[PDB]
Amino acid sequence: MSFSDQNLIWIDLEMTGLDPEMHKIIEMATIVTDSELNILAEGPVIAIHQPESELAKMDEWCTTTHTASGLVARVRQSQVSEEEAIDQTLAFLKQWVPEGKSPICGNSIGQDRRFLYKHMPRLEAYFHYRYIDVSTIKELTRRWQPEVLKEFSKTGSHLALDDIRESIAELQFYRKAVFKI
Ligand code: NA
């Protein structure tokens, strides 16, 4: 439909921790916007099954965060592996954006990309090599005109789809508040 090589792929992952070599992906969500940030389509929101031995690597922050959000229960009940989650996500993305065209979009999205390289390289390969990191603009705004940041806030629930929606909202806010294009 609105298929375009200008569309942007937004992605957020939840993990059992901060180290791709030790930890695992437990949730993935994708959203496609057009080049003007209008949300065209939301992709699969997938809790990825992990065994207790992997959930047992979570520290207090991860355990409490992902238990309170309901994600841990969804992970335990999930019947979807990483490979199946890749398959579902690629089947969605192919309907909206051509392969290799969109940068990876989100907040501190380099961290998610590290997990993709390690655990989902077939999905990492779908992105252009560049990164659209909304937190780059956050950090520049904090230094150049920090009072701007008081006009926007986030809930930060660590539910992957809700967090990526907040990433898009943050960039929409910067478009009006700190850009002149
Ligand atoms: Na994130």
Numbering used by the authors: 1 to 181
Task: Quote the study's own text.
Here, we show that Orn exhibits exquisite substrate preference for diribonucleotides.
Instead, we were able to crystallize two representative homologs, OrnVc and the human REXO2 (also known as small fragment nuclease or Sfn [Bruni et al., 2013]), bound to the diribonucleotide pGpG. The pGpG-bound structures reveal a narrow active site that is lined by the conserved acidic residues of the signature DEDD motif (D12, E14, and D112 of OrnVc; D15, E17, and D115 of REXO2) and the general base H158 or H162 in OrnVc or REXO2, respectively. In OrnVc, the bases of the diribonucleotide buttress against aromatic residues W61 and Y129, the latter being contributed from the second half-side of the dimeric enzyme. Residue L18 in OrnVc (L21 in REXO2) wedges in-between the two bases. This phosphate cap creates a major constriction of the active site, which is not observed in structurally related 3'−5' exoribonucleases such as RNase T or ExoI. By this assay, quantification of the diffusion zone reveals that OrnVc exhibits the highest affinity for diribonucleotide (Kd pGpG = 90 -/+9 nM), as compared to oligoribonucleotides of greater lengths. Mutations of the central phosphate cap residue R130 to alanine led to complete loss of catalytic activity, comparable to mutants in the DEDD active site motif. While expression of wild-type OrnVc complements the P. aeruginosa ∆orn resulting in a dispersed culture, complementation with variants that carry mutations in either the active site or phosphate cap residues results in cell aggregation indistinguishable from the ∆orn phenotype.
